[PDB]
Structure 1
Amino acid sequence: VLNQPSSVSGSLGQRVSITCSGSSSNVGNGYVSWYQLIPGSAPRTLIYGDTSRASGVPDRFSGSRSGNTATLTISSLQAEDEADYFCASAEDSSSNAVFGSGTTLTVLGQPKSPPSVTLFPPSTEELNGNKATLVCLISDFYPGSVTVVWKADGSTITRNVETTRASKQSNSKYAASSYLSLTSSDWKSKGSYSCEVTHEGSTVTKTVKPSEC
């Protein structure tokens, strides 16, 4: 696998360079290509033959090569540029393509944003099956990093909690979810349950009461 940095950054409007290090048998052979992978979308060819741009690729994307190291430079960074980037190169044969380890690009300079929090009680249909899943949906926060704490009657819960890691929404901010998996009887045995979300040292809490749903 060709060597790329696992992650790099660069603020809006600026430029950033992603390197791709190999040997004289792949990169040095002198036909490197680059690809763009935005989540929830098909991969996009950017560069081929070290420097040539694929159709519909703006000039602010540009590739170069220096011996056994290729470089993809992206000028005038936009939030749309946040994606995984991969280099590639044939080796000892045109049917033997070798991709790079991949680089996760981050575009900084984004305004900090607190999370919106919606806590859902279990449905009646789920309760009829003797299960009770509380769903805490967290959205529109930046940077994408929250910690979630669950409570029952103000007392912390450690058991039966599962939280997804943050991913981007098409509005460019972050969203995450957390689930508390109870039985129906557990759900009824408490006065209240709470979803407590901390972001940047500040916490938002939502509470539901079984007595009222």
Structure 2
Amino acid sequence: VLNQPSSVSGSLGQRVSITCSGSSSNVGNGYVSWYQLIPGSAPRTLIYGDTSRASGVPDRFSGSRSGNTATLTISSLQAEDEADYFCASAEDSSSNAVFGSGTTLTVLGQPKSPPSVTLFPPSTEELNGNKATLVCLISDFYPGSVTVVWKADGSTITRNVETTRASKQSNSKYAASSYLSLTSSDWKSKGSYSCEVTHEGSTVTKTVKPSEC
């Protein structure tokens, strides 16, 4: 395995470097590649042949090599660059390959971003099965933490609620979901339900009324 730093960090709009150390028989042989891994996406080839950029790769990604150490340098960091970076090289034949241990790149100094919240009522089709799921979708928030409160006719609901942890989107912001699982009768018995999402001291409220859905 090629030696990479487990973790590396840089600030927004600045420059960072990730190294990749091997031996004469891999990195020293002089044809190192670099790959980018974002959650929810397949690996992306960034660099090949030490220095060449693959199709669609911005100029601010650059590679180089000195003896048995290769370097991926990213200038003008953006939030979307937060990701896992891997190097690779052939080993003793063009058919035998070695990957690096990987480096997680964190981008510091990202601005605060409030959550976009959508509340969906149960569909008619689900109601026909005597089930009613209210779906609260929460996206595009940074940093990655929200708190969710459900309400109905002025009273807070806790039972039959399920809320996911925050997960990182492809654009570096975060997303999360909350589900209120009721029976059709429960759903019809109230005048309104609300999803209330708090993030960094700010609150967003969305509401549905069975008499309007």
User: Does the 8 Å contact 1:115/1:199 carry over to 2?
Assistant: yes
Q: Is the 8 A contact 1:19 1:69 kept in 2?
A: yes
RMSD: 3.5
Following superposition, the deviation at residue 15 of structure 1 comes to 0.4
Q: Please report how far the alpha carbon of residue 99 of structure 1 lies from its aligned counterpart in structure 2 after TM superposition.
A: 2.3
Give the C-alpha shift of residue 134 in structure 1. 0.5
Q: CA deviation at 1:78?
A: 3.3
- When residues 54 and 127 of structure 1 are mapped into structure 2, their CA distance, relative to the original with a 3 A threshold, is closer
SS in 1 for 2:203: strand
Contact 1:16 1:73 in 2 (8 A): yes
Distance 1:170 1:17, change over 3 A: closer
Q: Take 1:5 and 1:155, find their aligned partners in 2: how far apart are those partners?
A: 51
> Displacement, 1:120?
1.8
| Residue 75 of structure 1: how far off its partner (Å) | 1.1
Q: Distance in 1 between matches of 2:56 and 2:136?
A: 41
Q: Which moved more, 1:127-136 or 1:146-155?
A: 146-155
CA distance in 1, matches of 2:112, 2:208: 28
The answer as to whether partners of 1:134 and 1:180 remain within 8 angstroms in 2 is yes
SS in 2 for 1:28: helix
Check 1:157–1:25 CA distance in 2 against 1; reply closer, same or farther (3 A cut): farther
Report the identity percentage: 100
The whole-number CA distance in structure 1 between the counterparts of 2:19 and 2:157 is 45
Whole-Å separation in 1 of the counterparts to 2:41 and 2:167: 14
Q: Matches of 2:66 and 2:160 in 1, distance apart?
A: 53
- 1:134-187 Cα deviation digits (max 9, x unpaired): 011223322333232334555555554344455666877544332222222332
Q: Could you tell me how far 1:203 is from its partner in structure 2?
A: 2.8
1:36 aligns with 2:33: no
Using the TM superposition, give the Cα deviation of residue 42 of structure 1 relative to its aligned residue in structure 2, in angstroms: 5.6
Q: What's the TM-score once normalised by structure 2's chain length? A: 0.75
Deviation at 1:56, TM superposition (A): 6.0
Q: What number of residue pairs does the alignment pair up?
A: 213
| Contact 2:82/2:172 (8 A) holds in 1 | no
- Cα offsets for 1:57-78 (capped at 9, x unmatched): 5543222345654321111223
Q: Is 1:26–1:91's contact at 8 Å kept on the other side of the alignment? A: yes
Are the equivalent residues in 2 in contact too, given 1:154–1:194 (CA < 8 A)?
no
Q: 1:127 to 1:95 in 2, by over 3 A?
A: same
- With over 3 angstroms needed to count, the CA separation of the structure-2 counterparts of 1:114 and 1:59, relative to structure 1, is closer
Shift of 1:2: 3.8
| CA 1:52–1:116: 2 relative to 1, 3 Å | closer
**More displaced 10-residue stretch of structure 1: 164-173 or 101-110:** 164-173
The equivalent of 2:17 in structure 1 is 17
Whether contact under 8 Å (1:116, 1:140) holds in the other structure is yes
The DSSP-based 3-state class of the residue aligned with 1:119 is: strand
Instruction: Call closer, same or farther: CA 1:166–1:68 in 2, change over 3 Å.
Output: farther
Q: Which position in structure 2 is the counterpart of 1:91?
A: 91
Q: Which structure 1 residue ranges, 5 or more long, are not aligned?
A: none
Return the TM-score normalized by structure 1: 0.75
Q: 1:73 to 1:156 in 2, by over 3 A?
A: same
